[PDB]
């Protein structure tokens, strides 16, 4: 009987004109919400009697009635990656177990970033200050960007890579606005790693810094850091800079209180190269007869990134030959290709 | 597209495209102010040549003051073969 | 605007179409920099193509004025185009 009634109710229901999707600009205290509606212009509406406006909040995507103008539901809020580009990555997948060769870096990185964030109380009790910025300088793309993501997975924060130029809009302020908004986002999401993307290259990432807006943007960030130790004396959001060049830097920028720590990123050695390889091989089908000591010794003038190329190039040779289990023969042949590419220019 | 489409129906016909520098430039400082609209027009042009749309009895002539913003791709034959100068 | 300028000019004849400034649109660049400044090249070219697209008539006159001459081109030449050069 209920099943007959139910259909009946739907039959009636379907004769609505529908609802509009709208975006909350802001809640006010007057029982109204300002809505920028997407099919139409912008409207002030009076929310439903079933909720307050402190039962709502700004930046919510909403369903508003086309008939009675009341927020019938709230969907979800606008996701954190936005603008020209910007990538926020919740739960960083990298770890110190995902790259090896980091024995030199591990003690160094731990004190500079981990010990202040994880224990504020220590820093305070000592009367040592929290560093304002860190600069990492090293050979490109080896696993510099990867380390940042690792430290962020341990300290339990979103790793936020911000592309300097994408924060270069051709309109009044809108650009200046974006720069400000970003700080607002990472203050809300505290703790957070802000990794300043585009003063480094991983090979797949364009623009290593320039005479335009990458060095200037890099000044802006420092300013923010001063201000936090100022009025609010709260600071839980740290910025990590990565660079390959000393021509993006100036001495007041390296002066303690803008950038306080200058940590060397691992230059690649034979022992270090084997380690990384062993970790990446521990995901896939390679023969036990292989000797990572041989493969490591074959490679000189290869980064962390190159080791990754070798493993997939090796796989493509087995695959063609219609086998799923790789050999030392494939691994040498793959290395020889990669080696020639470093010999060019 | 329409212009080429009609040239093939009613062929022979000449499509005289004046100033293929506004409609098939290749930037110089990599802006897209209105210069993505430049990409749209150039792109359409290549597609018809490169495709299975058949020109041979349908003729295209481009005119441009100085040749400085034509891609190597156009200079390959079957696009522009013949490049006539003024002395 | 120019094609409308000329169409209304043909209707209104005798008419003097008076163009103040001919260096403001009279830059058009000479490099691959014309890409950007294509509005200024195209407008200047459009009046000259129209002027040469008819001859042996004086229905429309166009007369051009500069604040200080810094522009002259081999394109301006022809009798149906800007014949007369008065200093």
């Amino acid at each position: 009987n209920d099943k007959v009634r139910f259909i009946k109710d739907e039959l009636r229901l379907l004769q609505e004109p529908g609802s509009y999707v709208g975006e909350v600009i802001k809640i006010v205290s007057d029982k109204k919400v300002l809505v920028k509606v997407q099919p139409e212009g912008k409207y002030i509406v009076d929310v439903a009697k079933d909720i307050n406006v402190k039962d709502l909040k700004a930046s919510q995507r909403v369903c508003l009635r086309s008939d009675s103008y009341m927020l019938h539901k709230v969907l979800e809020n606008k996701a954190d990656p936005l603008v020209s580009l910007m990538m926020v990555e919740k739960v960083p997948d990298s770890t110190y177990d995902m790259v090896g060769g980091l024995t030199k870096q591990i003690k160094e990185i731990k004190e500079v970033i981990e010990l202040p964030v994880k224990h504020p109380e220590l820093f305070e009790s000592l009367g040592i200050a929290q560093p304002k910025g860190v600069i990492l300088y090293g050979p490109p793309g080896t696993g510099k960007t990867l380390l940042a993501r690792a430290v962020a997975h341990h300290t339990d924060c979103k790793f936020i890579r911000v592309s300097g130029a994408e924060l270069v809009q051709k309109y009044i302020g809108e650009g200046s606005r974006m720069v400000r908004e970003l700080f607002v986002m990472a203050r809300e999401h505290a703790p957070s790693i802000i990794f300043m993307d585009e003063i480094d290259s991983i090979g797949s990432t364009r623009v290593e810094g320039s005479g335009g807006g990458d060095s200037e943007v890099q000044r802006t960030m420092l300013e923010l850091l001063n201000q936090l130790d100022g009025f609010e004396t709260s600071k839980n959001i740290k910025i990590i800079m990565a660079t390959n060049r000393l021509d993006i830097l100036d001495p007041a920028l390296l002066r303690p209180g803008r950038i306080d720590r200058k940590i060397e990123f691992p230059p690649p050695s034979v022992a270090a190269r084997a380690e990384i390889l062993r970790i990446h091989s521990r995901k896939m089908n390679l023969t036990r007869g292989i000797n990572l000591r041989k493969v490591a010794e074959k490679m000189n003038g290869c980064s962390g990134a190159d080791v990754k190329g070798v493993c997939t190039e090796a796989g493509m040779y087995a695959l063609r030959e219609r086998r799923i289990h790789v050999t030392q023969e494939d691994f040498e042949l793959a290395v020889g290709k990669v080696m020639n590419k470093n010999q060019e220019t | 597209r329409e212009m080429f489409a009609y040239a093939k129906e009613h062929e022979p016909c000449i499509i005289f495209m004046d100033e293929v520098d506004a409609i098939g430039g290749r930037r110089f400082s990599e802006g897209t102010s209105a210069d993505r609209e430049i990409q749209r027009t150039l792109m359409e042009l290549l597609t018809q040549m490169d495709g299975f749309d058949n020109l041979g009895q349908t003729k295209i002539i481009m005119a441009t003051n100085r040749p400085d913003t034509l891609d190597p791709a156009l200079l390959r034959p079957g696009r522009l073969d013949r490049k006539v100068e003024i002395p | 605007l120019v094609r409308d300028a000329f169409a209304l000019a043909k209707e209104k004849a005798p008419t003097i179409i008076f163009i103040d400034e001919l260096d403001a649109i009279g830059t058009k660049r000479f490099d691959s920099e014309k890409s950007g400044d294509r509005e200024v090249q195209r407008t200047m070219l459009e009046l000259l193509n129209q002027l040469d697209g008819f001859s042996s008539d004086d229905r429309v006159k166009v007369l051009a004025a500069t604040n200080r001459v810094d522009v002259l081109d081999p394109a301006l030449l022809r009798s149906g185009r800007l014949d007369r050069k008065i200093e």
């Binding site: 300002l34 212009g41 000592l126 009367g127 302020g173 807006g213 100022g230 007041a252 | - | -």
Partner: protein, 362 residues
């Protein structure tokens, strides 16, 4: 109390009746739009997004002078009548500005800058302390000062201190972000900064490291980049053309004051030109004493000893030392710091700062 009650009983009945007559107008859907201009026949033109534009008479909740051209307003959904005023939406574009109410810093924390601290105090601080006092006297004290040294050594700090004393909004303005690569763009960004400064007085306006928008050249406009010159002339016009008593004070910052045009300095606004002295032995002691109050350390550390062997270090180097010696203690898992940590720390910063090239001496 008794007063509330006298009022409640007539006020109630009138309020309900007024609230109602408003709500019959205000009823949904009513579209938001923005007021273009107010015509002087006491009409007004409104720009609607949906493309009515109409000349309508106001309806109250606001007055004709409680509105200006370009304000956001509430519009009727057939006659486009101005029912009420509303607040901008769909993202007000505001330029990079950092707000610091009473930034935590004082003269005492950085003491031994004695000579500069009096100069900034007379010019900036005391006029802000005296508001009606600047209105009555009417004559200008210094509007503005220039501070030139090295940032976060005195230049950042001094401006932070004076801001704390007078309960003024401290506004940190990023010199470079005004260096946008567009045209029209620099001066309107610069103008926006000044607009907001006058609206939200009192304030000290700290403009960080002006040399990227500057560069003097030899001419007042040049055939080089136009955008860098444009922002510079707007900046010169903004001091020269509006003057303040005390309601807005400007602190300008630059590492080298001689790369600035001499007419962009302009006496009669920027009267004070404040420069940086080097620490003597006694100042080093003072600057050190504060930084260690906030530490915990061993009692075998002798201040006098460290100070004598330091020679020609500025306070920034002194701050770095506190952190570096303290870092070796944090490595040994200890929240004291020994004598030994300091010695190695003093030596190292000393070494790096004190690079020799035989340019001293004579």
């Amino acid at each position: 109390f008794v007063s509330n009650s006298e009022i409640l009983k007539p006020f109630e009945k009138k309020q309900e009746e007024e609230k109602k007559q408003l709500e019959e107008i205000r009823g949904n859907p009513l579209s938001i739009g923005t007021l273009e201009e107010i015509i002087d026949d006491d009409h007004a033109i409104v720009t609607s997004p949906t493309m009515p534009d109409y000349y309508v008479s106001i309806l109250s909740f606001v007055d004709k002078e409680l509105l200006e051209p370009g304000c956001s307003v509430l519009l009727h959904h057939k006659t486009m009548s101005i029912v009420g005023v509303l607040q901008d939406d769909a993202d007000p574009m505001v330029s990079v500005m950092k707000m610091d109410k009473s930034p935590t810093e004082s003269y005492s924390d950085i003491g031994g800058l004695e000579s500069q601290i009096q100069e900034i105090k007379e010019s900036v601080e005391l006029p802000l302390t005296h508001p009606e006092l600047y209105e009555e006297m009417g004559i200008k004290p210094p509007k503005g000062v220039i501070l030139y040294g090295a940032p976060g050594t005195g230049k950042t700090l001094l401006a932070k201190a004076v801001a704390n004393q007078t309960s003024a909004t401290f506004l940190r303005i990023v010199g470079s972000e005004l260096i946008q690569k567009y045209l029209g763009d620099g001066p309107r960004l610069c103008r926006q900064i000044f607009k907001v400064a006058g609206e939200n007085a009192p304030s000290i306006v700290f403009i960080d490291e002006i040399d990227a928008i500057g560069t003097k050249r030899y001419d007042s406009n040049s055939g080089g980049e136009r955008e860098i010159q444009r922002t510079m002339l707007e900046l010169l016009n903004q001091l020269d053309g509006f003057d303040d008593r005390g309601d807005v004070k400007v602190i300008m910052a630059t590492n080298k004051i001689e790369t600035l045009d001499p007419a962009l300095i302009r006496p009669g606004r920027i009267d004070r030109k404040i420069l940086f002295e080097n620490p003597d032995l006694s100042t080093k002691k003072k600057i050190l004493g504060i930084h260690t109050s906030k530490m915990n350390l061993s009692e075998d550390v002798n201040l006098e000893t460290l100070v004598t062997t330091k020679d020609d270090l500025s306070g920034a180097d002194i701050q770095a030392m506190c952190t570096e010696a303290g870092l070796l203690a944090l490595r040994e898992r200890r929240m004291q710091v020994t004598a030994e940590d300091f010695k190695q720390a003093k030596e190292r910063v000393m070494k790096n700062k004190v690079e020799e090239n035989l340019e001293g001496l004579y």
